[PDB]
Amino acid sequence: SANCTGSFDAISASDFVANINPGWNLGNSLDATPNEDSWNNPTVQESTFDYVKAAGFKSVRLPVTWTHHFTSESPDWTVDPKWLQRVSDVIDMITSRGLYTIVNVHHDSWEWADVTKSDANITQIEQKFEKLWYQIGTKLACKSSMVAFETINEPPCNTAEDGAKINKFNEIFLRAINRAGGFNAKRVVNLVGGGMDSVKTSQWFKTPANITNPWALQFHFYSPYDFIFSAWGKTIWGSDSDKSELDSTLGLLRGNFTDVPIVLGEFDASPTNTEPAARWKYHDYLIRSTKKYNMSPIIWDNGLDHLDRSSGIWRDPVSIEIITNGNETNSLPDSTVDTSAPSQSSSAYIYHKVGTEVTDQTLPFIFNDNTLVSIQDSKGTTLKADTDYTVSGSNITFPASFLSTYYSETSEPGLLPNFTLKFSSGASPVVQLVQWDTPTLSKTSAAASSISGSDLSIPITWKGLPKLATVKALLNNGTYLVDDFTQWFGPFGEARTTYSNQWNWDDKNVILTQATVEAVVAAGQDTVFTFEFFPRVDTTTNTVNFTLTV
């Protein structure tokens, strides 16, 4: 149908997948609802993609939510021509800077295309979905080979019967875009399995019979759930069994798709909620695994996770170096990975409590055969080797005389300068000086029936790192408020609750969600909430209690 005037440099799906490594998501933008500035990001501007290219990414994934841009319903399901034009212009912002693109159908997946809901009209879902990709395929028919199409984001899928419906999603998609013509018959596509989960995909994905597009599989990876989602008090990552769990997940997917190009379309241990040493060990090992199993990774970034689009600053430059220079071996700060350990340490920090003396701090590092070249603080000062710090094996020691030029027994708590360590190769990790103390809350108790309706914001005086580590929740009689099974999760996991589901924080508050409050009212029992902070030196010192009464 569509007729393109120029030429099209055909590329195989293997080469496309090889050429996009690594990618970066334009998250919470064209996927935001109803408009691209409806969530946390402003209107997309082109300089964003300059920062992305400058950082070493070779591609951008471009999630688009179409739900709120239809100007007619059945049977045409016309998409707003201004929206199609906005998607097309932003793709042109990406490609014109030499970056590959992958554009999809995003939150439509659960907003209207959910086949697991008991009332879903599968006929209407299939018809609207065909019409949608016919229109996107028409608008984007003449894009270069650097533009690929992804079926649909994480489609909900619980059973084999649902898995057959996700396969049909891939088939309806291929038929629509080939019918739209232009260059689409030779365009690289990304096909999807249930939830974009490695296991559901392995179980139920079937290659569309007689497919003729060059095609790659895409999945998403947010495992392990406890670390990545900050659930049940998990604040560490890197044991031998954590590594084997991760390598097993990627290898069993590759094992089911031996000769198929595989895109890892989203992953992120976000700097917002995860501990940095565990975060950098996780990203390092994930990148190592994607190279082992020949997968191209694309990091998720919602605008607040990594790149600050208004300044070009990446909030976590160590992860970006790890993801963008995959042929280099990284020296990393060590950290506690033992879930039975009664104390948690991290070499991404130099911690010092208010009211304690200044002492030498030895930080164990994983050198990985790199040597340390230099250390420079965030004011520009290069540290004097063998005076401001000394190296012994994997240890880096900072003498008390040097550390006391940054803090004292009585200095104010908060974030101090950090140290950037330059090694022979690989990422340059960051050690963060934190002067900490036990935080205080404006309220120590409250009646459940007086704070109700909404989330409970409790104003807090942060003393050190302005981040919450987890929240313990115990009923008065000793029963856990939620999730019994955390009794098997060690001193720092027993009775702990989950980020966003149960607890949250902001600049001025710690937060207990409305569902946490309603869970106390239902239990009918006073519940003690122990807010816990970094360093997790033990289970009690660096914590503060709030009691919800009944």
Ligand X SMILES: *[C@@H]1O[C@H](CO)[C@@H](O[C@@H]2O[C@H](CO)[C@@H](O[C@@H]3O[C@H](CO)[C@@H](O)[C@H](O)[C@@H]3O)[C@H](O)[C@H]2NC(C)=O)[C@H](O)[C@H]1NC(C)=O
Ligand Y SMILES: *[C@@H]1O[C@H](CO)[C@@H](O[C@@H]2O[C@H](CO)[C@@H](O[C@@H]3O[C@H](CO[C@H]4O[C@H](CO[C@H]5O[C@H](CO)[C@@H](O)[C@H](O)[C@@H]5O)[C@@H](O)[C@H](O[C@H]5O[C@H](CO)[C@@H](O)[C@H](O)[C@@H]5O)[C@@H]4O)[C@@H](O)[C@H](O[C@H]4O[C@H](CO[C@H]5O[C@H](CO)[C@@H](O)[C@H](O)[C@@H]5O)[C@@H](O)[C@H](O)[C@@H]4O[C@H]4O[C@H](CO)[C@@H](O)[C@H](O)[C@@H]4O[C@H]4O[C@H](CO)[C@@H](O)[C@H](O)[C@@H]4O)[C@@H]3O)[C@H](O)[C@H]2NC(C)=O)[C@H](O)[C@H]1NC(C)=O
Ligand Z SMILES: *[C@@H]1O[C@H](CO)[C@@H](O[C@@H]2O[C@H](CO)[C@@H](O[C@@H]3O[C@H](CO[C@H]4O[C@H](CO)[C@@H](O)[C@H](O)[C@@H]4O)[C@@H](O)[C@H](O[C@H]4O[C@H](CO)[C@@H](O)[C@H](O)[C@@H]4O[C@H]4O[C@H](CO)[C@@H](O)[C@H](O)[C@@H]4O[C@H]4O[C@H](CO)[C@@H](O)[C@H](O)[C@@H]4O)[C@@H]3O)[C@H](O)[C@H]2NC(C)=O)[C@H](O)[C@H]1NC(C)=O
Ligand U SMILES: OC[C@H]1O[C@@H](O[C@H]2[C@@H](OC[C@H]3O[C@@H](O[C@H]4[C@H](O)[C@@H](O)[C@H](O)O[C@@H]4CO)[C@H](O)[C@@H](O)[C@@H]3O[C@@H]3O[C@H](CO[C@H]4OC[C@@H](O)[C@H](O)[C@H]4O)[C@@H](O[C@@H]4O[C@H](CO[C@H]5OC[C@@H](O)[C@H](O)[C@H]5O)[C@@H](O)[C@H](O)[C@H]4O)[C@H](O)[C@H]3O)OC[C@@H](O)[C@@H]2O)[C@H](O)[C@@H](O)[C@H]1O
160 counts as binding ligand X under rule CB under 6 A: no
With CB cut-offs between 5 and 8 Å by kind, which of ligand Z, ligand Y, ligand U, none does residue 530 bind? ligand Y
Pick from 182, 261, 303, 333: which binds ligand Z (CB under 6 A)? Answer: 303
Residues 323-342 that bind ligand MAN (CB under 6 A): 336, 341
Segment holding 401, helix H or strand E = helix 400-403
CB contact at 8 A, 193 and 160: no
With CB cut-offs between 5 and 8 Å by kind, which of ligand Y, ligand MAN, ligand NAG, none does residue 392 bind? ligand NAG
With CB cut-offs between 5 and 8 Å by kind, which of ligand BGC, ligand Y, ligand Z, none does residue 92 bind? none
Pick from 120, 164, 199, 441: which binds ligand U (CB under 6 A)? Answer: 199
Where helices occur in 311-383 by DSSP H, the ranges are: 317-324
Residue type, 454: S
Min dist. Cβ of residue 461 to ligand U (A)? 31
Residue type, 432: Q
Pick from 239, 256, 272, 438: which binds ligand X (CB under 6 A)? Answer: 256
If one counts every other C-beta atom within 10 angstroms of the C-beta of residue 209, the result is: 7
If one counts every other C-beta atom within 10 angstroms of the C-beta of residue 479, the result is: 12
Q: Which stretch binds ligand Y (CB under 6 A): 141-149, 170-178, 364-372, 540-548?
A: 540-548
- Opening angle at CA 70, ends 65 and 75, nearest 5: 125
538 counts as binding ligand Y under rule CB under 6 A: no
39 counts as binding ligand BGC under rule CB under 6 A: yes
With CB cut-offs between 5 and 8 Å by kind, which of ligand BGC, ligand Y, ligand NAG, none does residue 258 bind? none
CB contact at 8 A, 60 and 95: no
| CA pair distance 490, 69, nearest whole angstrom | 49
Interface characters, 15-54, with ligand Z (x: CB under 6 A):
-------------------------xxx------------
Q: How far apart are the first and last CA of the chain?
A: 68
Residue type, 550: V
Q: Phi, psi at residue 239, to the nearest 5°?
A: -65, 165
CB contact at 8 A, 348 and 280: yes
Closest CA to 401 of 390, 388, 386: 388
Pick from 19, 35, 124, 203: which binds ligand X (CB under 6 A)? Answer: 203
483 counts as binding ligand Y under rule CB under 6 A: no
Q: Which stretch binds ligand X (CB under 6 A): 160-168, 248-256, 303-311, 362-370?
A: 248-256
Q: 484: which 2 tokens?
A: 């019994």
Closest CA to 536 of 487, 442, 471: 471
Closest CA to 485 of 472, 495, 473, 499: 495
Interface characters, 474-493, with ligand U (x: CB under 6 A):
-----------x--------
543 counts as binding ligand Y under rule CB under 6 A: yes
40 counts as binding ligand BGC under rule CB under 6 A: yes
With CB cut-offs between 5 and 8 Å by kind, which of ligand U, ligand BGC, ligand MAN, none does residue 40 bind? ligand BGC
Angstrom CA distances, 49 to 25, 140, 236, 300, 305, stand at: 11, 20, 33, 15, 16
Cβ proximity to ligand BGC: between 39 and 293 the closer is: 39
Give residue for tokens 């790149």.
Answer: 307
Going through 258-360 in order, the beta strands assigned E by DSSP cover 262-266, 295-299, 332-333, 349-353
Segment holding 417, helix H or strand E = strand 414-423
494 counts as binding ligand Y under rule CB under 6 A: yes
* Pairing of β 543-549 and β 527-532: antiparallel
Pick from 116, 239, 376, 418: which binds ligand Z (CB under 6 A)? Answer: 418
Residues 341-360 that bind ligand MAN (CB under 6 A): 341, 343, 345
110 counts as binding ligand BGC under rule CB under 6 A: no
Min dist. Cβ of residue 366 to ligand MAN (A)? 14
Pick from 220, 243, 281, 352: which binds ligand U (CB under 6 A)? Answer: 220
Contact residues for ligand Z (CB under 6 A)?
40-42, 303-304, 308-311, 313, 315, 378, 418, 430, 432
Please report, as ranges, the residues that interact with ligand MAN according to CB under 6 A. Answer: 336, 341, 343, 345
